[PDB]
Design a protein around this ligand. Sequence first.
Ligand SMILES: CC[C@@H]1/C=C(\C)C[C@H](C)C[C@H](OC)[C@H]2O[C@@](O)(C(=O)C(=O)N3CCCC[C@H]3C(=O)O[C@H](/C(C)=C/[C@@H]3CC[C@@H](Oc4ccc5c(ccn5CC)c4)[C@H](OC)C3)[C@H](C)[C@@H](O)CC1=O)[C@H](C)C[C@@H]2OC
Ligand SMILES: CC[C@@H]1/C=C(\C)C[C@H](C)C[C@H](OC)[C@H]2O[C@@](O)(C(=O)C(=O)N3CCCC[C@H]3C(=O)O[C@H](/C(C)=C/[C@@H]3CC[C@@H](Oc4ccc5c(ccn5CC)c4)[C@H](OC)C3)[C@H](C)[C@@H](O)CC1=O)[C@H](C)C[C@@H]2OC
Ligand SMILES: CCCCCCCO[C@@H]1O[C@H](CO)[C@@H](O)[C@H](O)[C@H]1O
Lengths: 107, 107
Amino acid sequence: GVQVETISPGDGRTFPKRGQTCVVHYTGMLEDGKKFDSSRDRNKPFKFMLGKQEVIRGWEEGVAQMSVGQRAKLTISPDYAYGATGHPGIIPPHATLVFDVELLKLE
Amino acid sequence: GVQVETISPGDGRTFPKRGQTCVVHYTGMLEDGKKFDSSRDRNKPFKFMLGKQEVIRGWEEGVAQMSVGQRAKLTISPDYAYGATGHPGIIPPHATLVFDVELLKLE
Ligand SMILES: CC[C@@H]1/C=C(\C)C[C@H](C)C[C@H](OC)[C@H]2O[C@@](O)(C(=O)C(=O)N3CCCC[C@H]3C(=O)O[C@H](/C(C)=C/[C@@H]3CC[C@@H](Oc4ccc5c(ccn5CC)c4)[C@H](OC)C3)[C@H](C)[C@@H](O)CC1=O)[C@H](C)C[C@@H]2OC
Ligand SMILES: CC[C@@H]1/C=C(\C)C[C@H](C)C[C@H](OC)[C@H]2O[C@@](O)(C(=O)C(=O)N3CCCC[C@H]3C(=O)O[C@H](/C(C)=C/[C@@H]3CC[C@@H](Oc4ccc5c(ccn5CC)c4)[C@H](OC)C3)[C@H](C)[C@@H](O)CC1=O)[C@H](C)C[C@@H]2OC
Ligand SMILES: CCCCCCCO[C@@H]1O[C@H](CO)[C@@H](O)[C@H](O)[C@H]1O
């Protein structure tokens, strides 16, 4: 599944609800540190609606536990991400992913 | 540190404040699935006061981020549990523990 470890606390009260849009900042890394992508590098936050199956499973359940302002490390297993096929030219097969995510705002 | 993996969601609203009694149902397991204790087996809900350093650090920080009704898996690193000194027969030296915990209510 997805393991959630808090790095820095949020407000501890405002959590993502079904139908809301989550604006977050992230950095995707492989099990061995190799950074593969980062929204921080492009200076543009990422957005997705909760409960609409837009992002990989690890993200859907992982970010739903975070509160506004919280920075957390999500460890996601292959079955909750790209599985055995992986993703062409970027994510290897049976890859365990670790994301440094920060929930910026809900709207 | 401590890693939380939510099995079943909680109300997402009621969180234990430092000074309240948490009533839980846990199952203590070792890194390799081997169970060493369970409140479930003896059907006796465990209670501890959040704040007073009664329990291991992992539980203090882990349960603090759970809401009533939530059932999660706490993966505690040695430094947040019993550390270096092992206790032959039950918990080995520098062991990572896994606790299946369900938050029943607050008192
Ligand atoms: C179109 C471009 C579109 C690009 C954008 C909006 C810009 C974004 C900022 C994404 C980034 O752009 C730099 C980049 O971000 C990553 O780096 C990443 O960090 C990551 O992990 N993210 C992104 C952040 C949220 C979590 C996760 C994700 O959710 O990403 C999603 C993802 C990659 C999911 C897979 C889609 C295909 C499924 O499989 C299928 C589905 C249908 C299929 C087949 C085969 C045939 N069919 C149909 C007949 C296979 C597979 O199923 C596990 C899941 C992203 C957000 C998609 O929703 C939307 C897109 O891809 C990805 C590694 C690659 C991705 O760029 C690409
Ligand atoms: C009095 C009996 C009292 C017993 C009960 C109320 C019955 C309970 C249902 C406990 C269970 O009884 C089946 C049993 O539960 C385990 O099975 C377990 O599942 C577990 O892990 N639990 C219990 C559930 C919460 C998490 C964790 C815990 O936190 O439990 C706490 C625990 C054991 C904390 C340690 C205390 C000692 C510290 O040691 C130190 C540290 C530093 C010290 C000294 C002395 C000097 N110094 C200075 C250097 C001692 C050590 O420090 C890391 C931390 C428990 C709740 C204590 O608060 C209270 C008790 O023990 C343990 C494997 C053994 C434990 O039986 C005991
Ligand atoms: C099976 C667990 C039994 C728990 C009760 C006994 C606790 O003993 C103490 O445990 C601490 C961490 O292990 C050590 O730092 C202490 O030096 C040691 O005296």
